Amino acid sequence: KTHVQLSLPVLQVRDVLVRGFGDSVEEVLSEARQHLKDGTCGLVEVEKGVLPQLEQPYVFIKRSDAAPHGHVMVELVAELEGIQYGRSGETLGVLVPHVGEIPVAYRKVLLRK
């Protein structure tokens, strides 16, 4: 399937134990896609002061369309030193590994895979 229905645990930035997916744009997109498939991917909602508490490169989920079955269609865009690899809509949040942090909510998305 080109798209997969996922429910992503929304984590508070100060709870996150592993604050990024790796060290290159290509690695973080790779790792983010693997964790999304394995159900080991969390979402941090971007507000003032969140991104400097996480590790670059960042992986964003961005709205790719204007929401089948409640699930917003999203795609991945990475960012490193102010350059983004990908072009998409509004940021829903930044992806991080999930290693058992208690979420505050769940974000239903349809992921272009």
mmCIF file of all heavy atoms in Angstrom, residues 13 16 18-20 44 49-56 58 94-96:
data_model
loop_
_atom_site.group_PDB
_atom_site.id
_atom_site.type_symbol
_atom_site.label_atom_id
_atom_site.label_comp_id
_atom_site.label_asym_id
_atom_site.label_seq_id
_atom_site.Cartn_x
_atom_site.Cartn_y
_atom_site.Cartn_z
ATOM 1 N N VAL A 13 8.111 17.130 24.826
ATOM 2 C CA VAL A 13 9.552 17.223 24.453
ATOM 3 C C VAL A 13 10.451 16.860 25.648
ATOM 4 O O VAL A 13 11.456 16.159 25.427
ATOM 5 C CB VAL A 13 9.896 18.610 23.871
ATOM 6 C CG1 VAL A 13 9.764 19.726 24.885
ATOM 7 C CG2 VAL A 13 11.278 18.605 23.251
ATOM 8 N N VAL A 16 11.102 13.047 26.175
ATOM 9 C CA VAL A 16 11.720 12.258 25.087
ATOM 10 C C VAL A 16 13.137 11.835 25.479
ATOM 11 O O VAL A 16 13.964 12.701 25.762
ATOM 12 C CB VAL A 16 11.698 13.041 23.761
ATOM 13 C CG1 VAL A 16 12.480 12.306 22.685
ATOM 14 C CG2 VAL A 16 10.256 13.283 23.322
ATOM 15 N N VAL A 18 15.169 9.675 23.388
ATOM 16 C CA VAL A 18 16.058 9.596 22.196
ATOM 17 C C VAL A 18 15.570 10.696 21.255
ATOM 18 O O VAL A 18 14.445 10.569 20.756
ATOM 19 C CB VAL A 18 16.045 8.211 21.533
ATOM 20 C CG1 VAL A 18 17.074 8.129 20.406
ATOM 21 C CG2 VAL A 18 16.246 7.108 22.557
ATOM 22 N N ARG A 19 16.368 11.754 21.107
ATOM 23 C CA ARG A 19 15.881 13.086 20.679
ATOM 24 C C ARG A 19 16.077 13.276 19.170
ATOM 25 O O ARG A 19 15.827 14.384 18.688
ATOM 26 C CB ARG A 19 16.566 14.141 21.529
ATOM 27 C CG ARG A 19 15.903 14.241 22.894
ATOM 28 C CD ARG A 19 16.599 15.145 23.871
ATOM 29 N NE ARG A 19 15.854 14.989 25.102
ATOM 30 C CZ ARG A 19 14.770 15.675 25.435
ATOM 31 N NH1 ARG A 19 14.319 16.640 24.655
ATOM 32 N NH2 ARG A 19 14.178 15.416 26.582
ATOM 33 N N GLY A 20 16.436 12.213 18.463
ATOM 34 C CA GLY A 20 16.471 12.203 16.991
ATOM 35 C C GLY A 20 16.741 10.819 16.476
ATOM 36 O O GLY A 20 16.963 9.905 17.296
ATOM 37 N N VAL A 44 6.265 14.878 18.412
ATOM 38 C CA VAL A 44 6.323 16.062 19.311
ATOM 39 C C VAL A 44 5.758 17.263 18.560
ATOM 40 O O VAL A 44 6.233 17.557 17.469
ATOM 41 C CB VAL A 44 7.755 16.338 19.805
ATOM 42 C CG1 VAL A 44 7.771 17.485 20.795
ATOM 43 C CG2 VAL A 44 8.379 15.095 20.416
ATOM 44 N N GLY A 49 10.592 26.878 21.403
ATOM 45 C CA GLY A 49 11.576 26.258 22.308
ATOM 46 C C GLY A 49 11.660 24.751 22.172
ATOM 47 O O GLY A 49 12.594 24.165 22.747
ATOM 48 N N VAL A 50 10.757 24.124 21.414
ATOM 49 C CA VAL A 50 10.776 22.641 21.251
ATOM 50 C C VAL A 50 11.977 22.220 20.414
ATOM 51 O O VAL A 50 12.725 21.314 20.864
ATOM 52 C CB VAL A 50 9.470 22.114 20.643
ATOM 53 C CG1 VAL A 50 9.643 20.705 20.106
ATOM 54 C CG2 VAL A 50 8.339 22.219 21.639
ATOM 55 N N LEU A 51 12.143 22.769 19.209
ATOM 56 C CA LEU A 51 13.156 22.228 18.267
ATOM 57 C C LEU A 51 14.570 22.300 18.833
ATOM 58 O O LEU A 51 15.371 21.397 18.601
ATOM 59 C CB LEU A 51 13.024 22.927 16.913
ATOM 60 C CG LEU A 51 11.861 22.422 16.042
ATOM 61 C CD1 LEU A 51 11.727 23.235 14.765
ATOM 62 C CD2 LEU A 51 12.045 20.948 15.699
ATOM 63 N N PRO A 52 14.982 23.371 19.549
ATOM 64 C CA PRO A 52 16.339 23.413 20.104
ATOM 65 C C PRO A 52 16.595 22.337 21.174
ATOM 66 O O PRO A 52 17.745 22.027 21.429
ATOM 67 C CB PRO A 52 16.472 24.838 20.659
ATOM 68 C CG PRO A 52 15.383 25.614 19.967
ATOM 69 C CD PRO A 52 14.250 24.628 19.755
ATOM 70 N N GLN A 53 15.535 21.727 21.716
ATOM 71 C CA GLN A 53 15.648 20.617 22.697
ATOM 72 C C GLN A 53 15.741 19.271 21.966
ATOM 73 O O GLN A 53 15.918 18.253 22.632
ATOM 74 C CB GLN A 53 14.456 20.628 23.652
ATOM 75 C CG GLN A 53 14.378 21.888 24.497
ATOM 76 C CD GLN A 53 13.287 21.776 25.527
ATOM 77 O OE1 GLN A 53 13.372 20.970 26.452
ATOM 78 N NE2 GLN A 53 12.261 22.602 25.390
ATOM 79 N N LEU A 54 15.617 19.251 20.641
ATOM 80 C CA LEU A 54 15.744 17.995 19.862
ATOM 81 C C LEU A 54 17.013 18.062 19.019
ATOM 82 O O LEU A 54 17.606 19.158 18.924
ATOM 83 C CB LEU A 54 14.485 17.804 19.015
ATOM 84 C CG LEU A 54 13.202 17.681 19.833
ATOM 85 C CD1 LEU A 54 11.989 17.670 18.929
ATOM 86 C CD2 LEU A 54 13.241 16.434 20.709
ATOM 87 N N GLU A 55 17.425 16.914 18.488
ATOM 88 C CA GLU A 55 18.665 16.756 17.702
ATOM 89 C C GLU A 55 18.361 16.894 16.207
ATOM 90 O O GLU A 55 17.425 16.264 15.711
ATOM 91 C CB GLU A 55 19.296 15.405 18.026
ATOM 92 C CG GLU A 55 19.810 15.356 19.442
ATOM 93 C CD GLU A 55 20.274 13.993 19.903
ATOM 94 O OE1 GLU A 55 20.025 13.016 19.175
ATOM 95 O OE2 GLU A 55 20.897 13.919 20.986
ATOM 96 N N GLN A 56 19.191 17.648 15.504
ATOM 97 C CA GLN A 56 19.192 17.703 14.020
ATOM 98 C C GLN A 56 20.024 16.556 13.476
ATOM 99 O O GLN A 56 20.914 16.085 14.159
ATOM 100 C CB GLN A 56 19.841 18.991 13.542
ATOM 101 C CG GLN A 56 19.072 20.229 13.933
ATOM 102 C CD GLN A 56 19.571 21.418 13.155
ATOM 103 O OE1 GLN A 56 19.792 21.340 11.942
ATOM 104 N NE2 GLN A 56 19.771 22.524 13.858
ATOM 105 N N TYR A 58 16.273 17.058 11.875
ATOM 106 C CA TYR A 58 14.849 16.831 12.234
ATOM 107 C C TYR A 58 14.109 16.094 11.116
ATOM 108 O O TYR A 58 14.429 16.304 9.901
ATOM 109 C CB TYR A 58 14.082 18.130 12.465
ATOM 110 C CG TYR A 58 14.750 19.101 13.398
ATOM 111 C CD1 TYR A 58 14.960 20.415 13.012
ATOM 112 C CD2 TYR A 58 15.144 18.724 14.674
ATOM 113 C CE1 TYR A 58 15.565 21.327 13.863
ATOM 114 C CE2 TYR A 58 15.744 19.627 15.542
ATOM 115 C CZ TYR A 58 15.959 20.930 15.129
ATOM 116 O OH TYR A 58 16.545 21.826 15.966
ATOM 117 N N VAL A 94 7.237 17.007 14.926
ATOM 118 C CA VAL A 94 8.573 16.411 14.661
ATOM 119 C C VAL A 94 8.537 14.974 15.171
ATOM 120 O O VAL A 94 8.009 14.731 16.276
ATOM 121 C CB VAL A 94 9.710 17.249 15.277
ATOM 122 C CG1 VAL A 94 9.428 17.592 16.724
ATOM 123 C CG2 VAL A 94 11.074 16.574 15.141
ATOM 124 N N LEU A 95 9.080 14.052 14.386
ATOM 125 C CA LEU A 95 9.100 12.628 14.744
ATOM 126 C C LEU A 95 10.340 12.341 15.568
ATOM 127 O O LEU A 95 11.434 12.883 15.262
ATOM 128 C CB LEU A 95 9.086 11.758 13.494
ATOM 129 C CG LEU A 95 7.858 11.881 12.608
ATOM 130 C CD1 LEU A 95 7.950 10.862 11.497
ATOM 131 C CD2 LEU A 95 6.573 11.703 13.395
ATOM 132 N N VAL A 96 10.168 11.440 16.537
ATOM 133 C CA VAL A 96 11.270 10.945 17.399
ATOM 134 C C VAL A 96 11.008 9.467 17.626
ATOM 135 O O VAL A 96 9.878 9.000 17.546
ATOM 136 C CB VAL A 96 11.354 11.733 18.723
ATOM 137 C CG1 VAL A 96 11.732 13.196 18.552
ATOM 138 C CG2 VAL A 96 10.057 11.631 19.505
#
